[PDB]
Design a binder for this molecule. Structure first.
Ligand SMILES: Nc1ncnc2c1ncn2[C@@H]1O[C@H](COP(=O)(O)OP(=O)(O)OP(=O)(O)O)[C@@H](O)[C@H]1O
Ligand SMILES: N[C@@H](CCC(=O)N[C@@H](CS)C(=O)NCC(=O)O)C(=O)O
Ligand SMILES: N[C@@H](CCC(=O)N[C@@H](CS)C(=O)NCC(=O)O)C(=O)O
Ligand SMILES: CC/C=C\C[C@H]1C(=O)CC[C@@H]1CC(=O)O
Ligand SMILES: CC[C@H](C)[C@H](N)C(=O)O
Lengths: 214, 569, 214
């Protein structure tokens, strides 16, 4: 059974968790201690030493999105994540990059920072969620006619939504109800109803992060 | 002592004497060497009264494969004498190949005598046609800046380099050329690409007294004026501020040029004006030194296609054709230099060797025996077979010449030739296609610099441990070592076969050395070959050199403008 | 006819040009003045305003790596950059991400900055060309048994090697020779051999960048 080296509060590890659960793969979950990383984490990824890492057939796959694409290409029989068209997978890649970079930079600034960077990040976050709001035109999901690739990529920030709400002092739902509510449809799915830890714990965790570093 | 009338008269007399002197030339070549081991297996002792006939009946025709082992016996630690005789001061290489492979040939000072004399005679007859000033100079695109020592401590040399670095070059040359615009150390600079830039700069230096534009070839000339089109602005900058360009990296020649410079602004104004008034640089040569009477170089055969680009360069300036012979033996001279390059013909000088010719008349080829030099027929076409002091005795060089006419009793010859071509199967490869591909592969690292690679060669060094390969690149100019070192790695990385892989990976054959040389090394090669006596089928340059190839090989080492051993591996 | 929005020194623009030329497309290049981003460009990426941009079917395709796999999916009959297995795909993508991260900033650091900044970037890229050289191992290329996906991705950095060498006043070859070594090999493909500008100029561009910001 495929082995995930992961981190419970991580949204990215969640992306991999989502992908295997949506498919129908049976797998073993592993919690890494970055303070005392397990031998398989060091042996699989000797340079960056980061999660997630899925070992399937004795061959390691690192980074979250690279795993998600690895999950889709390895199992292409039931629920395909991408469209059949070159240009449609194109836009999903374009957008997974957007969620993964600037969206993830603005939110990291929402939960991991103070003062001007926080306010700046808040302005960014609402724009980015507004932009995401905008790409949807207004679309139930992202990646195909069902659950999809950039859905997977972003639905994991939904367990931190509560944390951004709290630390950023903003309603992502009053300003973009559709996106939070895009998350709450997807929350009916077991790949999101089992994979994402309680937002309460993430909220507690990220706050706790604020305590350890200054 | 060079004089016009007496030298031509003795020449005239020598030429009508063609038979005495040819026949006597055979006598002294074998009197000098009745001791050839090769001749022992032919059964020679000399003298006799059927001596000539004895040589033609007893002494069988020979090839590059059969002369390769002996003259190779000369060069590599066996300082031993063989086919001609004495351990020659230097050794030769020949275009086309000895089966894709290297061909050595002996050098003695005699080939210097032939040189000094044939240039004595060629210059005299041409100064008869194109009289020069006794105090003037000349733009000689001539180079010979490289000297290598073969594995036995024995020098092997190019026809260029051995004239020029010979102890009798300068003193023998003083009277029959107008003095060289280039100090010898830039001519002999470890960087003749930069030196050719400094050679332009040199010819350009005493322009008003300059009496001709020279290269052995039109392509040498064309290479210079195509390059002169490229860099004239940069050149005006160099001579201008009194400071030479940052392009020039060798200290001896930089010592030479700084010995020559001071800040002078007026002429930059001038040169810019003239260089930009011209139409695609037509008539450029008389534009530079207006008062040179002639452009001189070999114009016939395989270099005919370089006559017009040069004509484009030459304007209306008369193009005079150079004479004919080499280290492998001088053959012919132009005593009537005033004739056009398409009517161009060269006449034999007899005491240089004993030459015999193969008639091709029957079909192709045709089973006929060789006839006397003047027993050769007018209008018909024979191949040249060479006997002299150079290690050739009744040897087939492999190329066809036409008898157009006679100067008195000595016959005028014509060349419509190119490649001495058949080939055979190599071992300095590493498929020719792999070697060409090799250069092609790393060279684009240079193409990044708006340069192109102009020519290449390669070598097997088994004095060393482990022995290593050497690749040589002729190109468009100066650049940094890091790309070159990168490039060496790719030559290595371009030899695609599993084999080169097994060794150097294990390391039993040493890391290939890319020795970057300078502009026109392979032009030195082209220039010596076509001018070489037999018939312009003389141009397929050999790509990798076994311990049996010497012409490119003296030119090999000394202008290591850079020479690097793979820092990979 | 595919229209490329490109920039004479964009390593990324070169990723696109190399990828397309590697494949077999006859296309047109339009050089960008980023002081004056084009009407069709401001319509392709109104926010990023970033190139390379390949326009096909009147549909803008953006981001360099994104564009090259667009190269792959757009004409899937002749020259594939990926091998057949999904794992091999994940490895090449994985290694595609690698060139994009510490590699690019480190080089950005080597030719764009100086002093305390420079040496950090300096040991960063020798380290990169070292893990790089380690994974190159032996293969003539990277993303499969022939010219690959990521071949396209890191080859275009080999014209800036000259800038890195001089401003860093280094020689990246004696520490990891087989990489630059692999590079001038890769130059023999007609995709990089006609899509990539001169390095003396590229050095000079880095010189313009440097003289502006001291
Ligand atoms: N055609 C020719 N061109 C230039 N030099 C020639 C020619 N013929 C004879 N020589 C002369 O031979 C000289 C020496 O060249 P040399 O005979 O030494 O080289 P080599 O060692 O015999 O072998 P190679 O064939 O490489 O030149 C020169 O001094 C040179 O002038
Ligand atoms: N591209 C990677 C990098 C992600 C990343 O930085 N992840 C965090 C997990 S939340 C991590 O592993 N940090 C390791 C550390 O703390 O050094 C991915 O998305 O997996
Ligand atoms: N990952 C991107 C990086 C591209 C990038 O950073 N591009 C710069 C050129 S250095 C750009 O277009 N900047 C826009 C600008 O500076 O105006 C790609 O590969 O395309
Ligand atoms: C007698 C001439 C000595 C050297 C002559 C050389 C030149 O300077 C022009 C070529 C010629 C070489 C050649 O004719 O074989
Ligand atoms: C005088 C020597 C010249 C350059 C001759 N053509 C050679 O190449 O050897």
């Amino acid at each position: 059974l495929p082995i995930l080296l992961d981190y419970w509060p991580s949204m990215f590890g969640m992306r991999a968790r989502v992908a295997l659960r949506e498919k129908g793969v049976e797998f073993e979950y592993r919690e890494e201690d970055f303070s005392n990383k397990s031998p398989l984490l060091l042996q699989s990824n000797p340079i960056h030493k980061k999660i997630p890492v899925l070992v399937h057939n004795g061959k390691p796959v690192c980074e979250s999105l690279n795993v998600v694409q690895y999950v889709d290409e390895a199992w292409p029989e039931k629920n395909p994540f991408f469209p059949s068209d070159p240009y449609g997978r194109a836009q999903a890649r374009f957008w997974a990059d957007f969620v993964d970079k600037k969206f993830t930079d603005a939110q990291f600034k929402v939960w991991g920072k103070k003062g001007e960077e926080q306010e700046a990040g808040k302005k960014e976050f609402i724009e980015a969620v507004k932009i995401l709001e905008s790409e949807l035109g207004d679309k139930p999901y992202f990646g195909g006619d069902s659950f999809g690739y950039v859905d997977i990529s972003l639905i994991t920030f939904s367990s931190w939504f509560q944390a951004y709400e709290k630390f950023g002092n903003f309603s992502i739902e009053s300003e973009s109800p559709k996106l939070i509510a895009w998350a709450k449809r997807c929350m009916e799915k077991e790949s999101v109803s089992k994979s994402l830890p309680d937002s309460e714990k993430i909220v507690a965790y990220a706050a706790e992060y604020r305590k350890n570093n200054l | 002592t060079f004089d016009m009338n007496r030298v031509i008269d003795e020449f005239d007399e020598m030429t009508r004497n063609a038979h005495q002197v040819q026949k006597q030339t055979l006598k002294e070549i074998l009197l000098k060497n009745q001791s050839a081991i090769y001749l022992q297996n032919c059964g020679l002792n000399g003298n006799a009264t059927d001596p000539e006939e004895a040589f033609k009946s007893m002494v069988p025709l020979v090839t590059d494969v059969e002369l390769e082992p002996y003259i190779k016996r000369m060069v590599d630690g066996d300082t031993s004498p063989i086919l001609t005789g004495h351990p020659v001061p230097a050794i030769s290489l020949s275009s086309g190949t000895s089966q894709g492979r290297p061909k050595f040939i002996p050098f003695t000072d005699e080939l210097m005598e032939n040189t000094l004399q044939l240039f004595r005679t060629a210059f005299a007859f041409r100064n008869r046609d194109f009289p020069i000033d006794d105090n003037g100079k000349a733009l000689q695109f001539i180079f010979s800046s490289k000297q290598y020592i073969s594995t036995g401590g024995v020098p092997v040399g190019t026809a260029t380099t051995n004239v020029y670095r010979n102890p009798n070059f300068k003193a023998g040359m003083k009277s029959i050329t107008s003095p060289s615009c280039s100090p010898d150390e830039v001519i002999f600079s470890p960087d003749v690409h930069q030196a050719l830039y400094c050679h332009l700069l040199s010819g350009i230096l005493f322009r008003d007294q300059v009496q001709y534009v020279f290269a052995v070839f039109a392509h040498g000339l064309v290479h210079a004026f195509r390059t002169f089109e490229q860099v004239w602005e940069e050149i005006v900058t160099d001579i201008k501020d009194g400071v030479l360009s940052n392009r020039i990296t060798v200290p001896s020649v930089r010592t030479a040029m700084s010995k020559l410079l001071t800040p002078n602004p007026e002429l930059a104004e001038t040169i810019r004006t003239k260089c930009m008034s011209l139409s695609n640089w037509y008539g450029l040569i008389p534009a530079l030194f207006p008062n040179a009477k002639y452009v001189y170089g070999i114009m016939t055969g395989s270099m005919e296609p370089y006559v017009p680009k040069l004509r484009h360069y030459a304007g209306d300036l008369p193009l005079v054709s150079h004479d004919y012979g080499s280290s492998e033996g001088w053959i012919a001279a132009n005593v009537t230099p005033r004739l056009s390059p398409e009517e161009a013909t060269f006449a034999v000088i007899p005491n240089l060797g004993y030459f015999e010719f193969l008639p091709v008349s029957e079909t192709g080829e045709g089973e006929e025996k060789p006839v006397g030099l003047t027993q050769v027929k007018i209008g018909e076409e024979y191949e040249v077979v060479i006997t002299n002091y150079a290690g050739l005795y009744r040897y087939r060089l492999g190329d066809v010449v036409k008898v157009i006419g006679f100067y008195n009793n000595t016959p005028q010859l014509k060349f419509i030739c190119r490649r001495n071509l058949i080939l055979s199967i190599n071992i300095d490869k590493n498929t020719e296609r792999d070697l060409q591909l090799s250069v092609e592969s790393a060279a684009k690292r240079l193409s990044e610099e708006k340069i192109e690679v102009i020519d290449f060669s390669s070598y097997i060094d088994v004095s060393t441990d482990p022995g290593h390969y050497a690749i040589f690149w002729e190109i468009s100019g100066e650049t940094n070592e890091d790309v070159l070192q990168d490039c060496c790695n790719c030559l290595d990385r371009a030899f695609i076969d599993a084999g080169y892989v097994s060794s150097r990976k294990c390391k039993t054959i040493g890391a290939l050395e890319l020795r970057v040389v300078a502009k026109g090394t392979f032009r030195k090669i082209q220039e010596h070959f076509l001018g070489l006596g037999s018939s312009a089928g003389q141009f397929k340059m050999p790509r990798c050199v076994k311990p049996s190839n010497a012409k490119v090989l003296q030119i090999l080492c000394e202008n290591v403008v850079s020479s690097y051993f793979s820092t990979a591996f």
